[PDB]
Design a binder for this molecule. Sequence first.
Ligand code: CDL
Ligand code: PEE
Ligand code: PEE
Ligand code: LPP
Lengths: 100, 75, 54, 80, 93, 62, 124, 230, 61, 141, 100, 152
Amino acid sequence: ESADALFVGTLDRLTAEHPHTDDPRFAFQSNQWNNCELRFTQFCRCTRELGEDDPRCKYQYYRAQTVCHEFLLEDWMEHRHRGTCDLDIMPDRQVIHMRG
Amino acid sequence: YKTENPLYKDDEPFAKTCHTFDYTREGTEKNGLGYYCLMGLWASIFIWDSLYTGATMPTGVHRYVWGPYFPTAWF
Amino acid sequence: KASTLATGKGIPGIDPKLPTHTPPASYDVLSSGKARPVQVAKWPPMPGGVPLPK
Amino acid sequence: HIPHPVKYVGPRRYGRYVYGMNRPPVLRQVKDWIDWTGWNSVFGGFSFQVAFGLMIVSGVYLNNYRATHTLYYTNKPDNQ
Amino acid sequence: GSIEQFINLRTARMFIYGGVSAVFLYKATPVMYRWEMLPTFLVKTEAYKAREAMIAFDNMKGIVYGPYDKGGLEGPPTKIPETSVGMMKVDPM
Amino acid sequence: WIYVNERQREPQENVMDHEEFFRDFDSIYLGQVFDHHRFAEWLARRRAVKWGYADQIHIPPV
Amino acid sequence: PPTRLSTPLYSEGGAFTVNWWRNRYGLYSRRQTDPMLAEFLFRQQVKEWFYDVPSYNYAALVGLALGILVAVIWRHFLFNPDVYVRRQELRKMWPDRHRQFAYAVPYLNPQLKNLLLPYKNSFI
Amino acid sequence: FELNINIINYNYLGIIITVIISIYIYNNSNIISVYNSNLLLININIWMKYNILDMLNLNVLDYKILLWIVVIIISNEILLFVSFYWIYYHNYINYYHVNILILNSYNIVYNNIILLTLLSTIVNIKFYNYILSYYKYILSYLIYYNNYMFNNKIILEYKNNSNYTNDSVYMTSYFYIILLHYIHIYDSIILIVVYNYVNYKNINNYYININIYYHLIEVLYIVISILLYL
Amino acid sequence: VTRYPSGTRTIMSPYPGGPVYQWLRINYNYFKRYQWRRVGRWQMRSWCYWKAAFYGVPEWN
Amino acid sequence: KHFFTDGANDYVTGWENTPPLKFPASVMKPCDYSMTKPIPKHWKLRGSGIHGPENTDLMKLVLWNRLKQKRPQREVPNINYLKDSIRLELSVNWWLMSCIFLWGPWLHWGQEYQKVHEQPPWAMKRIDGLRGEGYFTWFLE
Amino acid sequence: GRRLLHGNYFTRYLFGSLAVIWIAEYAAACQYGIPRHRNPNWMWSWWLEKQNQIKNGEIPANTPGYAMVKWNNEAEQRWLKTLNVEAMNEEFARRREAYY
Amino acid sequence: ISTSETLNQKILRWLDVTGMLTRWHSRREFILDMDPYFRKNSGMWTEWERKTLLFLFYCCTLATPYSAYLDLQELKHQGTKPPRPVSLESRFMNQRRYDFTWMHPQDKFCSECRPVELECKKMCFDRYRSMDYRMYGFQRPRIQTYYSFSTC
Ligand SMILES: CCCCCCCCCCCCCCCCCC(=O)OC[C@H](COP(=O)([O-])OCC(O)COP(=O)([O-])OC[C@@H](COC(=O)CCCCCCCCCCCCCCCCC)OC(=O)CCCCCCCCCCCCCCCCC)OC(=O)CCCCCCCCCCCCCCCCC
Ligand SMILES: CCCCCCCC/C=C/CCCCCCCC(=O)OC[C@H](COP(=O)(O)OCCN)OC(=O)CCCCCCC/C=C/CCCCCCCC
Ligand SMILES: CCCCCCCC/C=C/CCCCCCCC(=O)OC[C@H](COP(=O)(O)OCCN)OC(=O)CCCCCCC/C=C/CCCCCCCC
Ligand SMILES: CCCCCCCCCCCCCCCC(=O)OC[C@H](COP(=O)(O)O)OC(=O)CCCCCCCCCCCCCCC
């Protein structure tokens, strides 16, 4: 309700209420690749917590589509289904802190 | 006779001619106190930034004896 | 050296006839003629110099 | 450059080596050597490593110990 | 009184210096132990034992014959290729 | 000579199963530093199993 | 500009002066083989390049261009949300890079952008 | 009176070297390329002989000319490495969160930095002897031992690395930067194998060139170590 | 003052050393000067890259 | 110094623009006739007047710059010059000592600590549940 | 003997440049009010909560992260078929007894 | 044990077994260890230059054993390098537009394997051997060869 409610809670909310507008974290740059990757990671984390059938995660996918072209999503969604998507590996099976 | 060990003699001066080399007024011979003050500040900023990690996020609440327009209210 | 005021004559530590410092020399007899008493301490000095009763 | 005098004030000769007799203490000799060959190289050479080591090891207290008691939202225990 | 006979320069230099050392080690040794600075052969910390107790040398699983795990349910190949069987020139036992 | 001498030797086991590695992370990831001789022997036995010459070699005891 | 080698040239003290320039001008020179000839060639160069009024205009232009250049480089490194030199945030997934997201809005609203955007009515 | 310069009127090495280069392109066998490289080495050595024989002109400016050429070349070597550092940092935003194992910061960097430092000390001793009109036979063989160990260590690292060039631009940049340094290390072997005492001493451009080049390569490794390992 | 052959007697001690020590000192001195340094002299003289550039050039009159 | 400079570090030819300071001015002096008094009008120009070997000082400079190349003994430079000649060499040697006795010890301590506690002694222990050593330069995090 | 550069040029411009870089960065952080407290962890809140449950003993030790999600990819289904946390814990317990 | 010398002298004598210390403390002994051709130029050296040269030379030669120790440990570490998890094939991992043939443009050995991918090549060489084509390498167990740095 509050006028600044969107900024309150998360920076994510801003684009969730206005899907086709600039995200505060990426509005400074015309290139929106990083924006797409954040949105996909957020869809991946939603399903892990709520499942695919949850309306929330379905909307997190619509939000990802708003910024990600279909040819990228289809490829990244196949990697996710196989279990090779680097944005969805469970954190205890990551290797980012190993050997350096 | 008396002699001087050449290894401990002083450096020869530049010749005094129409074309004379002089570095005395340049002050570039060695690092000065200012340089060592830069090193001290760098060490200080390095330690401070790590010790006090909430300094960049200060509190806007201010009392300020003698109000805000007194000189000790700007530091 | 130190033969002229320019060369350093009269400047202590620079003149051969003037020492850097002038500490009083030690003496073994008092000026009264009594032998100078000698004390050897085995404990640190009293805090204020406070003398102790005889 | 600026012509300057030789700054070495230590002993210019120890005398002929006679089975290591009548020679200064070892540490005195080490100090005289560096005086004779210049401390600028010592300071210059060791400066880089000293700086890097001091910064990395300083994290033992600045980044690790302090941090353990830095998070203001950690001292609070749940269900207490 | 009656201790002055002992009080002496050598007896003092080894009393201040030696006592200072007695407190330097008594106060620093626990810190060195905590921070793994002590030699391992001299003593092993409890944290060292806790980690070492988790180490064994008898695991013979996970052998694969491919550089990548490409997901799926089949996983990386686990069977040695036929063409590679008996290709090793092992010296006679 | 460095290259030739190395090329003759069988390849070391660069990688293992992703899952099995993380189920025994500490032993595998840290075994070398804690005891290198036993880790070396364990590696050798795994190479003998991966290339099917285990029954043709006698791995020296550690 | 004096025409006689007997008349000395005035020099300030510092790292860019007539004395500082004399010391270094002939370091790589095969033509300054003696004092008289060295001074003549030195004053010839100084007269030609430093007593030329229009040459100072280019000095201004190089300073201005270089100052802008150094500052734009520094500004990117120090403030641009997309330039990473530290690695803490690069070792995390995008949703978790809060410290880097803090640069975003302040960087999105520079002063000149606020000052000049109202003047679009002179182009449309 | 003589002319200031003894003009060189004709030269035929240029044609040969340029043809040798073409063979690299116009060939159907990689063995031909190996033998072609030997031809290149031979003819480049002839050009070096021409430089040594130009000493007979007793021209003071010859040392200076060659020295400044080396300065320009060193500059080009530094700028090529800069281009690789640029390629590396341009994709920095995609590093450190990918499922690859980056290199440790303890073993490789330390032994390599310690090794390359010893190489510098040897070259420095060679320079010192060069100044003192003296020679020490063992010095060159210490360089050979250092190069052998460097080659032995780099070969094992590459063979035992579990990530490949096609895995990520990070891995490609790591391998390429390390290879570029190695190539410059190998070029140092090419130069140093001929080190000997020449009695014309400090009018020999070889000595100054070797000192500069070795320092460049070691300094370049300091930059690489900070970027990749530390 | 007695002068010994170069590299054969130590100046660090009045005691010349024991049999093993003397053997090591004498034989290292021989190996360096008359065996190891054969390689260096051979490389310096017989395989000089700068002598080879002047091979076949007339003498300077 | 290593690099050759025609003006200062001219070791290829050994040319020096001025004579040694040891020589009396009556024997040899720097070539500087900028203070020559005005020529009387009744004097007539005999020589070319061109700057060159007709001037006594320049002639002596050329002569000395060639006859100085043979000398009975060395002209020992002072210790300041000798230090400067090998400044880089000495500094690199001390750098090697630092790398062995300063960098070496604490790097070893960090790895040993890492073995037991998973992360180096100068890093913040993680709670995310990820495994591995993690970063080493904590101030670049 | 004539000098071209600063007498201590190498150390001066190396350490000096580093000092200016560090100081300028602190100033930049202050002007933008950037949080300066280093966090070495991931910020996925649900994950950090699961990790606390493991530290509290609510979730058994060495339980994989894919044994706790509400959606599993194909590769994690493959792993779940061979997962036995109870056996893993017993094996670790046996190792501790042997060591002590 | 000789009692004709002090303990310090004995230690220094043994550190002088190769004559290093004697050459430092005697100019005559240093010049007479030079080969005659270079001894000709020795008289010009200052004692500063001589001992500084020995110091730089001695520091270098005394650190070579340390570097050798560090390098041996490196070889042993690489010789028993721990296995690492098999890489999951991520979004941008293992992309290929054409086979790997730049090493063998005409022969095209191991077109599917990467240039230094030793395990892929071993299995590929085995196929060629099974096809009556000899290839070198990847046949001797590591522990049965010299210089492997993998022995217990
Ligand atoms: C109760 C106490 C409580 C605690 C309080 C704590 C307070 C803080 C403590 C910390 C200290 C703060 C100090 C502040 C003021 C400092 C003032 C000062 O003296 O600074 C100047 C001092 C030295 O500067 P300087 O006075 O100009 O030097 C004098 C020279 O002697 C001038 O002579 P020169 O210039 O003639 O020198 C010789 C020079 C002569 O050279 C020449 O002639 C010029 C040559 C130039 C061209 C060179 C050609 C290329 C090289 C060829 C040779 C290559 C060899 C190596 C090859 C390697 C191959 C791998 O040679 C060289 O320097 C270079 C050649 C030698 C070899 C170079 C090796 C490579 C270097 C580059 C890489 C460096 C990074 C390596 C990283 C590791 C490896 C990857 O610098 C520093 O001390 C560094 C900065 C210090 C301040 C920042 C500290 C930040 C962190 C502080 C944390 C502390 C702990 C806090 C804990 C808090 C707990 C609450
Ligand atoms: C010698 C002793 C040992 C020294 C060891 C040093 C080891 C590390 C060296 C690393 C490289 C040098 C830079 C070090 C920087 C340290 C401070 C730091 O982390 O800075 C980070 C900061 C930004 O960090 P983030 O928070 O991730 O980004 C936020 C959004 N932008 O980056 C920097 O400031 C460093 C990078 C830029 C360095 C150079 C300064 C920038 C301007 C360059 C201008 C170039 C043009 C010419 C200038 C000429 C002179 C005016
Ligand atoms: C009355 C005053 C008394 C003061 C007494 C002061 C005593 C100070 C003692 C300091 C001891 C320091 C010991 C350091 C030991 C380090 C050993 C070590 O790490 O060895 C291995 C390590 C390399 O290990 P890697 O496996 O390759 O791993 C790292 C690279 N990957 O080797 C090195 O670091 C080599 C250098 C070893 C240096 C040892 C330093 C010893 C210093 C002794 C000082 C004694 C001072 C006494 C002062 C007395 C005053 C009265
Ligand atoms: C191409 C990239 C190159 C590398 C990066 C370049 C970065 C920029 C250039 C830096 C070059 C420095 C070289 C070293 C010069 C040197 O040491 O120069 C040294 C000089 C002193 O000269 P002396 O040695 O003669 O005393 O230092 C100074 O002049 C400063 C003295 C100390 C001042 C202490 C207090 C400073 C307060 C600063 C506040 C800043 C606030 C900012 C708000 C926005």
